[PDB]
Amino acid sequence: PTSSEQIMKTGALLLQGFIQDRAGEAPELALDPVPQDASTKKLSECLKRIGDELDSNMELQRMIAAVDTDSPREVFFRVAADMFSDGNFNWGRVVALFYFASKLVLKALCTKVPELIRTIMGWTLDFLRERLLGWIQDQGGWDGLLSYFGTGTWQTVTIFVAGVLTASLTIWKKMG
Amino acid sequence: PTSSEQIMKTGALLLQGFIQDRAEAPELALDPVPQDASTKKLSECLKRIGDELDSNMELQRMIAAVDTDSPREVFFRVAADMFSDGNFNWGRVVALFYFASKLVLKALCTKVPELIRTIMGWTLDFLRERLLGWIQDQGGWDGLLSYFGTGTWQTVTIFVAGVLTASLTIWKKMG
């Protein structure tokens, strides 16, 4: 079903996957790959493609560079809060949030702080549970995410998804 | 600067703004690209021309002829034809965005909201493949403002309406 547990599980899987897919290590600390069904695999392939396009948006990469490299806690929550501050929701924003969390993880890996992988995922899944889960339930599950994106629209949806993340980062940056 | 990325961003913002102002699945919404002072001036320019074009009855009759729920081939044929002489001017760009916006509005009317993203996709693909080199040689979108004075809204409208109506007539008559 469209139960809480399953939306949480799929969330954790997608995020972990994205951090695998963007990542192209403390072995005893690894979180094993959530196993993926047909449905989740299609979501994962969706996210990989939109992530690769976001990686090519230079304005967004300048903004992610500005993120407090080894102290990202306050920046994750302020960016997350701001992007959802109008009380509306869309799948582009959910994708933006997972992407950003994934880049924060990658920035920590570089800084060789691997216990942040767990911590950042924890912040993101807590945010999903507290703030997004109701909406994803009303939508009938994670499957809806696929229809936010279409086969001929990747370059175009990217602009708007990059745009929302870059905007919340700009406010975090300028407001200090 | 006026890199491909910024031309594409401003185009998406301008188009989204052209559409959003006139007029629905919320989970599918593309958030509004945020606007600086200069994009704001462009957007106000576009709203004004748009309002005038909406008053051109000949143009409204041709837009009504547009295949309501199957707009793909009409969009590309109209867009191709309008730029077929290999020249460019800002009137044509505006005509292309206006037309794409009316197509979106006609799709919303028929309750087909996934068309919002698809038509934007076609319009921005065309901007990227066909117009972007020219806008860069022009120094960016700011030049669009010089195509429109302040004392000439009824006058520039006739010619901008004329170009879009002409390409629609060719589409309609060639079948």
PDB file of N, CA, C and O in Angstrom, chain A residues 56-60 62 83 86 89-93 135 139 144 147-153 155-157 159-161 163-164 166-167, chain B residues 1 3-6 8-13 15-16 25-34 114 117-122 124-125 128:
ATOM      1  N   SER A  56      24.709  19.586 -14.163  1.00  0.00           N
ATOM      2  CA  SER A  56      25.183  20.512 -15.228  1.00  0.00           C
ATOM      3  C   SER A  56      24.671  21.924 -15.161  1.00  0.00           C
ATOM      4  O   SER A  56      24.974  22.719 -16.034  1.00  0.00           O
ATOM      5  N   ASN A  57      23.916  22.251 -14.119  1.00  0.00           N
ATOM      6  CA  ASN A  57      23.438  23.588 -13.949  1.00  0.00           C
ATOM      7  C   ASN A  57      24.491  24.312 -13.132  1.00  0.00           C
ATOM      8  O   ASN A  57      24.678  23.988 -11.935  1.00  0.00           O
ATOM      9  N   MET A  58      25.206  25.231 -13.778  1.00  0.00           N
ATOM     10  CA  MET A  58      26.346  25.896 -13.140  1.00  0.00           C
ATOM     11  C   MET A  58      25.901  26.863 -12.008  1.00  0.00           C
ATOM     12  O   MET A  58      26.538  26.894 -10.956  1.00  0.00           O
ATOM     13  N   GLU A  59      24.807  27.585 -12.181  1.00  0.00           N
ATOM     14  CA  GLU A  59      24.396  28.491 -11.149  1.00  0.00           C
ATOM     15  C   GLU A  59      24.147  27.668  -9.850  1.00  0.00           C
ATOM     16  O   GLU A  59      24.491  28.092  -8.725  1.00  0.00           O
ATOM     17  N   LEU A  60      23.480  26.531 -10.003  1.00  0.00           N
ATOM     18  CA  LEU A  60      23.192  25.671  -8.847  1.00  0.00           C
ATOM     19  C   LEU A  60      24.498  25.152  -8.201  1.00  0.00           C
ATOM     20  O   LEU A  60      24.578  25.170  -6.974  1.00  0.00           O
ATOM     21  N   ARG A  62      27.431  26.576  -8.188  1.00  0.00           N
ATOM     22  CA  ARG A  62      28.079  27.709  -7.429  1.00  0.00           C
ATOM     23  C   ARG A  62      27.424  27.824  -6.048  1.00  0.00           C
ATOM     24  O   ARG A  62      28.103  28.088  -5.051  1.00  0.00           O
ATOM     25  N   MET A  83      12.152  26.028   1.082  1.00  0.00           N
ATOM     26  CA  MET A  83      11.571  25.565  -0.167  1.00  0.00           C
ATOM     27  C   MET A  83      10.091  25.145  -0.007  1.00  0.00           C
ATOM     28  O   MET A  83       9.354  25.176  -0.989  1.00  0.00           O
ATOM     29  N   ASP A  86       5.668  27.920   1.535  1.00  0.00           N
ATOM     30  CA  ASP A  86       4.312  28.335   1.056  1.00  0.00           C
ATOM     31  C   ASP A  86       3.194  27.360   1.364  1.00  0.00           C
ATOM     32  O   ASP A  86       1.996  27.629   1.122  1.00  0.00           O
ATOM     33  N   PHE A  89       3.100  21.850  -2.272  1.00  0.00           N
ATOM     34  CA  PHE A  89       4.073  20.814  -2.478  1.00  0.00           C
ATOM     35  C   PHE A  89       3.980  20.491  -3.941  1.00  0.00           C
ATOM     36  O   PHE A  89       2.828  20.534  -4.541  1.00  0.00           O
ATOM     37  N   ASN A  90       5.133  20.096  -4.503  1.00  0.00           N
ATOM     38  CA  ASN A  90       5.140  19.440  -5.828  1.00  0.00           C
ATOM     39  C   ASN A  90       6.270  18.485  -5.863  1.00  0.00           C
ATOM     40  O   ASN A  90       7.228  18.587  -5.046  1.00  0.00           O
ATOM     41  N   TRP A  91       6.270  17.582  -6.840  1.00  0.00           N
ATOM     42  CA  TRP A  91       7.371  16.591  -6.899  1.00  0.00           C
ATOM     43  C   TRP A  91       8.708  17.200  -7.220  1.00  0.00           C
ATOM     44  O   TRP A  91       9.732  16.680  -6.782  1.00  0.00           O
ATOM     45  N   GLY A  92       8.760  18.290  -8.004  1.00  0.00           N
ATOM     46  CA  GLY A  92      10.056  18.990  -8.222  1.00  0.00           C
ATOM     47  C   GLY A  92      10.782  19.404  -6.928  1.00  0.00           C
ATOM     48  O   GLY A  92      12.052  19.345  -6.822  1.00  0.00           O
ATOM     49  N   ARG A  93      10.014  19.895  -5.942  1.00  0.00           N
ATOM     50  CA  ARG A  93      10.619  20.231  -4.709  1.00  0.00           C
ATOM     51  C   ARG A  93      11.168  19.015  -3.945  1.00  0.00           C
ATOM     52  O   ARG A  93      12.189  19.166  -3.239  1.00  0.00           O
ATOM     53  N   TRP A 135       1.432  14.382   2.234  1.00  0.00           N
ATOM     54  CA  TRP A 135       1.193  14.827   0.869  1.00  0.00           C
ATOM     55  C   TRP A 135       1.446  13.708  -0.117  1.00  0.00           C
ATOM     56  O   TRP A 135       0.644  13.472  -1.042  1.00  0.00           O
ATOM     57  N   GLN A 139      -1.297  11.807  -2.491  1.00  0.00           N
ATOM     58  CA  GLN A 139      -0.985  11.617  -3.890  1.00  0.00           C
ATOM     59  C   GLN A 139      -1.049  10.180  -4.345  1.00  0.00           C
ATOM     60  O   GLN A 139      -0.989   9.934  -5.538  1.00  0.00           O
ATOM     61  N   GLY A 144       3.692   8.825  -8.289  1.00  0.00           N
ATOM     62  CA  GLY A 144       3.283  10.076  -8.925  1.00  0.00           C
ATOM     63  C   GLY A 144       4.494  10.851  -9.406  1.00  0.00           C
ATOM     64  O   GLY A 144       4.391  11.731 -10.271  1.00  0.00           O
ATOM     65  N   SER A 147       5.269  11.126 -13.067  1.00  0.00           N
ATOM     66  CA  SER A 147       4.484  11.869 -14.036  1.00  0.00           C
ATOM     67  C   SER A 147       4.898  13.350 -13.950  1.00  0.00           C
ATOM     68  O   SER A 147       4.529  14.128 -14.794  1.00  0.00           O
ATOM     69  N   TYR A 148       5.683  13.742 -12.943  1.00  0.00           N
ATOM     70  CA  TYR A 148       6.190  15.110 -12.918  1.00  0.00           C
ATOM     71  C   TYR A 148       7.225  15.290 -14.039  1.00  0.00           C
ATOM     72  O   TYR A 148       7.538  16.433 -14.471  1.00  0.00           O
ATOM     73  N   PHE A 149       7.744  14.171 -14.516  1.00  0.00           N
ATOM     74  CA  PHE A 149       8.814  14.198 -15.489  1.00  0.00           C
ATOM     75  C   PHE A 149       8.350  13.387 -16.710  1.00  0.00           C
ATOM     76  O   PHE A 149       7.651  12.381 -16.578  1.00  0.00           O
ATOM     77  N   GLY A 150       8.684  13.842 -17.905  1.00  0.00           N
ATOM     78  CA  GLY A 150       8.296  13.080 -19.103  1.00  0.00           C
ATOM     79  C   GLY A 150       9.521  12.826 -19.942  1.00  0.00           C
ATOM     80  O   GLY A 150      10.565  13.473 -19.759  1.00  0.00           O
ATOM     81  N   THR A 151       9.406  11.891 -20.870  1.00  0.00           N
ATOM     82  CA  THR A 151      10.561  11.514 -21.678  1.00  0.00           C
ATOM     83  C   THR A 151      11.220  12.683 -22.468  1.00  0.00           C
ATOM     84  O   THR A 151      12.457  12.745 -22.550  1.00  0.00           O
ATOM     85  N   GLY A 152      10.425  13.603 -23.023  1.00  0.00           N
ATOM     86  CA  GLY A 152      11.011  14.725 -23.794  1.00  0.00           C
ATOM     87  C   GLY A 152      11.267  16.044 -23.049  1.00  0.00           C
ATOM     88  O   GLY A 152      11.487  17.084 -23.688  1.00  0.00           O
ATOM     89  N   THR A 153      11.285  16.013 -21.711  1.00  0.00           N
ATOM     90  CA  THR A 153      11.232  17.258 -20.909  1.00  0.00           C
ATOM     91  C   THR A 153      12.386  17.493 -19.907  1.00  0.00           C
ATOM     92  O   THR A 153      12.264  18.347 -19.019  1.00  0.00           O
ATOM     93  N   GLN A 155      15.741  18.476 -19.999  1.00  0.00           N
ATOM     94  CA  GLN A 155      16.338  19.806 -19.968  1.00  0.00           C
ATOM     95  C   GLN A 155      15.409  20.885 -19.415  1.00  0.00           C
ATOM     96  O   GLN A 155      15.859  21.771 -18.706  1.00  0.00           O
ATOM     97  N   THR A 156      14.099  20.758 -19.641  1.00  0.00           N
ATOM     98  CA  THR A 156      13.151  21.839 -19.216  1.00  0.00           C
ATOM     99  C   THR A 156      12.685  21.794 -17.761  1.00  0.00           C
ATOM    100  O   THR A 156      12.650  22.819 -17.054  1.00  0.00           O
ATOM    101  N   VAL A 157      12.310  20.611 -17.302  1.00  0.00           N
ATOM    102  CA  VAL A 157      11.985  20.452 -15.899  1.00  0.00           C
ATOM    103  C   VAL A 157      13.178  20.788 -14.985  1.00  0.00           C
ATOM    104  O   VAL A 157      12.959  21.494 -13.988  1.00  0.00           O
ATOM    105  N   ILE A 159      15.498  23.096 -15.378  1.00  0.00           N
ATOM    106  CA  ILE A 159      15.590  24.534 -15.116  1.00  0.00           C
ATOM    107  C   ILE A 159      14.773  24.885 -13.888  1.00  0.00           C
ATOM    108  O   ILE A 159      15.231  25.651 -13.037  1.00  0.00           O
ATOM    109  N   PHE A 160      13.523  24.404 -13.824  1.00  0.00           N
ATOM    110  CA  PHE A 160      12.630  24.839 -12.750  1.00  0.00           C
ATOM    111  C   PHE A 160      13.008  24.174 -11.430  1.00  0.00           C
ATOM    112  O   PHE A 160      12.910  24.774 -10.359  1.00  0.00           O
ATOM    113  N   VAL A 161      13.486  22.953 -11.519  1.00  0.00           N
ATOM    114  CA  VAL A 161      13.906  22.298 -10.289  1.00  0.00           C
ATOM    115  C   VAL A 161      15.211  22.910  -9.761  1.00  0.00           C
ATOM    116  O   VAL A 161      15.358  23.221  -8.552  1.00  0.00           O
ATOM    117  N   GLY A 163      16.081  25.924 -10.365  1.00  0.00           N
ATOM    118  CA  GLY A 163      15.617  27.248  -9.922  1.00  0.00           C
ATOM    119  C   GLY A 163      15.122  27.315  -8.507  1.00  0.00           C
ATOM    120  O   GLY A 163      15.554  28.227  -7.751  1.00  0.00           O
ATOM    121  N   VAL A 164      14.266  26.353  -8.106  1.00  0.00           N
ATOM    122  CA  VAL A 164      13.770  26.349  -6.718  1.00  0.00           C
ATOM    123  C   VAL A 164      14.868  26.098  -5.639  1.00  0.00           C
ATOM    124  O   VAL A 164      14.874  26.718  -4.561  1.00  0.00           O
ATOM    125  N   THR A 166      18.155  26.634  -6.068  1.00  0.00           N
ATOM    126  CA  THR A 166      19.104  27.769  -6.113  1.00  0.00           C
ATOM    127  C   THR A 166      18.458  28.946  -5.332  1.00  0.00           C
ATOM    128  O   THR A 166      19.129  29.646  -4.619  1.00  0.00           O
ATOM    129  N   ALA A 167      17.147  29.109  -5.462  1.00  0.00           N
ATOM    130  CA  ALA A 167      16.460  30.247  -4.751  1.00  0.00           C
ATOM    131  C   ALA A 167      16.553  30.095  -3.254  1.00  0.00           C
ATOM    132  O   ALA A 167      16.784  31.108  -2.528  1.00  0.00           O
TER     133      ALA A 167
ATOM    134  N   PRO B   1      26.555  36.494 -16.882  1.00  0.00           N
ATOM    135  CA  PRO B   1      26.758  37.137 -18.184  1.00  0.00           C
ATOM    136  C   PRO B   1      25.566  36.976 -19.110  1.00  0.00           C
ATOM    137  O   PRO B   1      24.426  37.286 -18.791  1.00  0.00           O
ATOM    138  N   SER B   3      25.563  33.861 -21.189  1.00  0.00           N
ATOM    139  CA  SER B   3      25.833  32.464 -21.406  1.00  0.00           C
ATOM    140  C   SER B   3      24.543  31.791 -21.815  1.00  0.00           C
ATOM    141  O   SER B   3      23.471  32.347 -21.571  1.00  0.00           O
ATOM    142  N   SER B   4      24.654  30.596 -22.408  1.00  0.00           N
ATOM    143  CA  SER B   4      23.501  29.799 -22.806  1.00  0.00           C
ATOM    144  C   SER B   4      22.640  29.516 -21.610  1.00  0.00           C
ATOM    145  O   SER B   4      21.418  29.511 -21.707  1.00  0.00           O
ATOM    146  N   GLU B   5      23.273  29.266 -20.457  1.00  0.00           N
ATOM    147  CA  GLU B   5      22.471  28.899 -19.305  1.00  0.00           C
ATOM    148  C   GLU B   5      21.531  30.059 -18.912  1.00  0.00           C
ATOM    149  O   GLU B   5      20.342  29.841 -18.584  1.00  0.00           O
ATOM    150  N   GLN B   6      22.038  31.284 -18.930  1.00  0.00           N
ATOM    151  CA  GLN B   6      21.218  32.420 -18.449  1.00  0.00           C
ATOM    152  C   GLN B   6      20.142  32.753 -19.475  1.00  0.00           C
ATOM    153  O   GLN B   6      19.052  33.223 -19.115  1.00  0.00           O
ATOM    154  N   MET B   8      18.671  30.566 -21.378  1.00  0.00           N
ATOM    155  CA  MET B   8      17.661  29.529 -21.213  1.00  0.00           C
ATOM    156  C   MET B   8      16.838  29.794 -19.950  1.00  0.00           C
ATOM    157  O   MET B   8      15.616  29.562 -19.945  1.00  0.00           O
ATOM    158  N   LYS B   9      17.501  30.234 -18.882  1.00  0.00           N
ATOM    159  CA  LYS B   9      16.783  30.451 -17.611  1.00  0.00           C
ATOM    160  C   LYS B   9      15.727  31.560 -17.762  1.00  0.00           C
ATOM    161  O   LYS B   9      14.607  31.443 -17.324  1.00  0.00           O
ATOM    162  N   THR B  10      16.174  32.681 -18.289  1.00  0.00           N
ATOM    163  CA  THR B  10      15.320  33.846 -18.533  1.00  0.00           C
ATOM    164  C   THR B  10      14.176  33.521 -19.473  1.00  0.00           C
ATOM    165  O   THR B  10      13.048  33.964 -19.196  1.00  0.00           O
ATOM    166  N   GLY B  11      14.451  32.731 -20.545  1.00  0.00           N
ATOM    167  CA  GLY B  11      13.374  32.244 -21.369  1.00  0.00           C
ATOM    168  C   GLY B  11      12.324  31.424 -20.657  1.00  0.00           C
ATOM    169  O   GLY B  11      11.103  31.603 -20.854  1.00  0.00           O
ATOM    170  N   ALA B  12      12.773  30.504 -19.815  1.00  0.00           N
ATOM    171  CA  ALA B  12      11.817  29.681 -19.088  1.00  0.00           C
ATOM    172  C   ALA B  12      10.955  30.538 -18.146  1.00  0.00           C
ATOM    173  O   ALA B  12       9.728  30.291 -17.989  1.00  0.00           O
ATOM    174  N   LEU B  13      11.633  31.450 -17.439  1.00  0.00           N
ATOM    175  CA  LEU B  13      10.941  32.401 -16.515  1.00  0.00           C
ATOM    176  C   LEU B  13       9.891  33.259 -17.270  1.00  0.00           C
ATOM    177  O   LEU B  13       8.752  33.431 -16.789  1.00  0.00           O
ATOM    178  N   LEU B  15       8.473  32.715 -20.242  1.00  0.00           N
ATOM    179  CA  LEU B  15       7.368  31.907 -20.711  1.00  0.00           C
ATOM    180  C   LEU B  15       6.386  31.469 -19.590  1.00  0.00           C
ATOM    181  O   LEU B  15       5.133  31.514 -19.760  1.00  0.00           O
ATOM    182  N   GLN B  16       6.962  30.990 -18.495  1.00  0.00           N
ATOM    183  CA  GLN B  16       6.187  30.582 -17.339  1.00  0.00           C
ATOM    184  C   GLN B  16       5.343  31.771 -16.867  1.00  0.00           C
ATOM    185  O   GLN B  16       4.157  31.630 -16.561  1.00  0.00           O
ATOM    186  N   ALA B  25      -3.216  20.750 -11.956  1.00  0.00           N
ATOM    187  CA  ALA B  25      -2.811  19.684 -10.998  1.00  0.00           C
ATOM    188  C   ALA B  25      -1.666  20.196 -10.121  1.00  0.00           C
ATOM    189  O   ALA B  25      -0.531  20.322 -10.598  1.00  0.00           O
ATOM    190  N   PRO B  26      -1.955  20.518  -8.838  1.00  0.00           N
ATOM    191  CA  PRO B  26      -0.897  21.233  -8.089  1.00  0.00           C
ATOM    192  C   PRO B  26       0.429  20.431  -7.924  1.00  0.00           C
ATOM    193  O   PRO B  26       1.511  21.042  -7.886  1.00  0.00           O
ATOM    194  N   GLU B  27       0.343  19.092  -7.861  1.00  0.00           N
ATOM    195  CA  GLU B  27       1.528  18.240  -7.607  1.00  0.00           C
ATOM    196  C   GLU B  27       2.538  18.266  -8.761  1.00  0.00           C
ATOM    197  O   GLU B  27       3.718  17.842  -8.593  1.00  0.00           O
ATOM    198  N   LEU B  28       2.053  18.806  -9.896  1.00  0.00           N
ATOM    199  CA  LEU B  28       2.788  18.919 -11.149  1.00  0.00           C
ATOM    200  C   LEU B  28       3.309  20.342 -11.421  1.00  0.00           C
ATOM    201  O   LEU B  28       3.905  20.586 -12.472  1.00  0.00           O
ATOM    202  N   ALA B  29       3.073  21.274 -10.485  1.00  0.00           N
ATOM    203  CA  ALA B  29       3.423  22.684 -10.731  1.00  0.00           C
ATOM    204  C   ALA B  29       4.922  22.824 -10.844  1.00  0.00           C
ATOM    205  O   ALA B  29       5.642  22.196 -10.074  1.00  0.00           O
ATOM    206  N   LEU B  30       5.355  23.630 -11.810  1.00  0.00           N
ATOM    207  CA  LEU B  30       6.726  24.122 -11.965  1.00  0.00           C
ATOM    208  C   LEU B  30       6.829  25.441 -11.177  1.00  0.00           C
ATOM    209  O   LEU B  30       6.095  26.410 -11.429  1.00  0.00           O
ATOM    210  N   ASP B  31       7.699  25.475 -10.185  1.00  0.00           N
ATOM    211  CA  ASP B  31       7.740  26.644  -9.317  1.00  0.00           C
ATOM    212  C   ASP B  31       8.210  27.858 -10.127  1.00  0.00           C
ATOM    213  O   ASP B  31       8.974  27.698 -11.082  1.00  0.00           O
ATOM    214  N   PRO B  32       7.771  29.063  -9.718  1.00  0.00           N
ATOM    215  CA  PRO B  32       8.157  30.271 -10.466  1.00  0.00           C
ATOM    216  C   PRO B  32       9.664  30.574 -10.342  1.00  0.00           C
ATOM    217  O   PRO B  32      10.169  30.762  -9.239  1.00  0.00           O
ATOM    218  N   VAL B  33      10.375  30.564 -11.470  1.00  0.00           N
ATOM    219  CA  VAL B  33      11.816  31.035 -11.509  1.00  0.00           C
ATOM    220  C   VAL B  33      11.894  32.450 -10.888  1.00  0.00           C
ATOM    221  O   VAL B  33      11.177  33.345 -11.324  1.00  0.00           O
ATOM    222  N   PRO B  34      12.770  32.692  -9.886  1.00  0.00           N
ATOM    223  CA  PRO B  34      12.639  34.034  -9.227  1.00  0.00           C
ATOM    224  C   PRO B  34      13.187  35.180 -10.105  1.00  0.00           C
ATOM    225  O   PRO B  34      14.117  34.965 -10.888  1.00  0.00           O
ATOM    226  N   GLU B 114      -0.748  18.127 -18.093  1.00  0.00           N
ATOM    227  CA  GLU B 114       0.571  17.616 -18.444  1.00  0.00           C
ATOM    228  C   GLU B 114       1.048  18.315 -19.708  1.00  0.00           C
ATOM    229  O   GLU B 114       2.253  18.418 -19.952  1.00  0.00           O
ATOM    230  N   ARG B 117       3.709  21.224 -19.242  1.00  0.00           N
ATOM    231  CA  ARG B 117       5.127  20.944 -19.289  1.00  0.00           C
ATOM    232  C   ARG B 117       5.655  20.570 -20.699  1.00  0.00           C
ATOM    233  O   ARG B 117       6.810  20.858 -21.056  1.00  0.00           O
ATOM    234  N   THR B 118       4.808  19.920 -21.476  1.00  0.00           N
ATOM    235  CA  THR B 118       5.203  19.406 -22.757  1.00  0.00           C
ATOM    236  C   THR B 118       5.327  20.594 -23.725  1.00  0.00           C
ATOM    237  O   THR B 118       6.264  20.675 -24.491  1.00  0.00           O
ATOM    238  N   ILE B 119       4.382  21.507 -23.677  1.00  0.00           N
ATOM    239  CA  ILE B 119       4.422  22.636 -24.608  1.00  0.00           C
ATOM    240  C   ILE B 119       5.571  23.525 -24.207  1.00  0.00           C
ATOM    241  O   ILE B 119       6.245  24.064 -25.060  1.00  0.00           O
ATOM    242  N   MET B 120       5.794  23.709 -22.898  1.00  0.00           N
ATOM    243  CA  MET B 120       6.946  24.523 -22.505  1.00  0.00           C
ATOM    244  C   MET B 120       8.194  23.873 -23.015  1.00  0.00           C
ATOM    245  O   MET B 120       9.110  24.550 -23.486  1.00  0.00           O
ATOM    246  N   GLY B 121       8.225  22.545 -22.940  1.00  0.00           N
ATOM    247  CA  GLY B 121       9.374  21.766 -23.381  1.00  0.00           C
ATOM    248  C   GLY B 121       9.669  22.024 -24.863  1.00  0.00           C
ATOM    249  O   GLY B 121      10.810  22.382 -25.241  1.00  0.00           O
ATOM    250  N   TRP B 122       8.628  21.909 -25.696  1.00  0.00           N
ATOM    251  CA  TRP B 122       8.806  22.236 -27.131  1.00  0.00           C
ATOM    252  C   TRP B 122       9.265  23.684 -27.368  1.00  0.00           C
ATOM    253  O   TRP B 122      10.084  23.941 -28.240  1.00  0.00           O
ATOM    254  N   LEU B 124      10.933  25.679 -25.337  1.00  0.00           N
ATOM    255  CA  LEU B 124      12.332  25.907 -24.872  1.00  0.00           C
ATOM    256  C   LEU B 124      13.331  25.085 -25.675  1.00  0.00           C
ATOM    257  O   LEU B 124      14.490  25.504 -25.858  1.00  0.00           O
ATOM    258  N   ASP B 125      12.949  23.912 -26.126  1.00  0.00           N
ATOM    259  CA  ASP B 125      13.801  23.230 -27.130  1.00  0.00           C
ATOM    260  C   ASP B 125      14.047  24.083 -28.353  1.00  0.00           C
ATOM    261  O   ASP B 125      15.178  24.152 -28.826  1.00  0.00           O
ATOM    262  N   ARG B 128      16.322  26.903 -27.534  1.00  0.00           N
ATOM    263  CA  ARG B 128      17.703  26.419 -27.438  1.00  0.00           C
ATOM    264  C   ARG B 128      18.326  26.071 -28.834  1.00  0.00           C
ATOM    265  O   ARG B 128      19.485  26.459 -29.125  1.00  0.00           O
TER     266      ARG B 128
END
